Amino acid sequence: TAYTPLDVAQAYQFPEGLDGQGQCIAIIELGGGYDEASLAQYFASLGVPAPQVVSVSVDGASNQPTGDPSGPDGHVELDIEVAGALAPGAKFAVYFAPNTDAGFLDAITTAIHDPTLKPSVVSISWGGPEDSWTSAAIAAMNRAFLDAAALGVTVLAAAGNSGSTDGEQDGLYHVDFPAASPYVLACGGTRLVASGGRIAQETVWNDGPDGGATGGGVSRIFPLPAWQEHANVPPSANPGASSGRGVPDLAGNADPATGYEVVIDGEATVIGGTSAVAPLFAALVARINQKLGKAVGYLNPTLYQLPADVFHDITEGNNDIANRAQIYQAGPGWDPCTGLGSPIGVRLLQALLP
Ligand SMILES: [Ca+2]
Fold it and tell me: What is the topology classification, in CATH, of domain 1-354?
């Protein structure tokens, strides 16, 4: 099982007749580059008019594809193919920074403050466990995301591809940063079975430690936000059971087993990860911005007050890949695997309309 990005947007009922025109989506990259030949062939094969793609160098880094499809080129082309396939009217600005937290910070503030490209959306699918970040870098990052919220820019981040432990074996549960930020729309991952625009079934992405699984959990750094106050977020499963910001907010297809068809450095292939969901929803927000005639910005508070039928609730599975305790599990409403669920594009747009 494999989908084009178009088949996925169809299952999530993205609003038709909108392609992101007049909008600029920013995409953060910390390594590799994209092969233009790949994009050219991919977009055409999908029937999509070649989108404008430009690179911006940050802290001396630049677009540098190595040709190795199994390298960071794959991260980069996945970001672009998936989003560019779904908002091809939008201008894509890809910011390349050194693979450091200072570079990542700098690429994000470069994007937000861009006086020329002024992106209205920032797509992020890089990060790490919050404990791997220093308190100072965490604080700089969060000022940035707040700034973003003040400028009407939406910021979206993949919640992780390693389950509730996010890759650590220090025997604790952890969420990823920057999705853990309250000012970031955290994107979880599901397993999607769909066709002709109707989802047949959608469960938690979890293919074990070998296969990867959706990030999700309870932030140990940030306290439960006011707008999450009655979303049924639990305390972390970690002893002490501190309450904290629940991750994620929304979720989309991320299971490589029901994966995305893309072309990485010439080779046809199928990928997944929550890495595909931020750019997928980045394109949804850009289409919605076009319709609105202005950037929607920071959506987290809005999302949590929308009626339930704006989402496809995910209620089965868990995102534990380290033990059999099923920490965390899906269920009715918000859960620490899939958050509010998958959005139903046309209904989110209708709620956002005057
Ligand atoms: Ca749910």
Answer: Rossmann fold (3.40.50)
DSSP count for the chain of H helices, then E strands: 9, 17
Closest by Cα among 187, 183, 175, 220 to 301: 183
List the one residue out of 217, 241, 233 whose CA is nearest residue 334: 233
Which pair of tokens denotes residue 342?
Answer: 């998958």
Tokens representing residue 344 in the block: 């139903």
Cα-to-chain-centroid distance, residue 43: 21
This PDB structure is determined at a resolution in Å of 2.0
Residue by residue, DSSP assigns 64-126 as ---S-TTTHHHHHHHHHHHHHHH-TTSEEEEEE--SSHHHHHHHHHHHHT-TTT--SEEEE--
Ligand 1 centre distance from Cα of residue 332 (Å) = 5
Distance 233 CA to ligand 1 centre (A): 11
- Dihedral of the CA atoms 65, 67, 72, 74 (nearest 10)? 110
Q: How far apart are CA 86 and CA 81, in angstroms?
A: 9
Specify whether the CB–CB gap between 300 and 139 falls below 8 A: no
How much distance in Å is there from the Cα of 189 to the middle of ligand 1? 12
Lateral strand order in the sheet of 259-264: 2-3, 259-264, 267-271
CA atoms within 13 A on the CB side of 326: 8
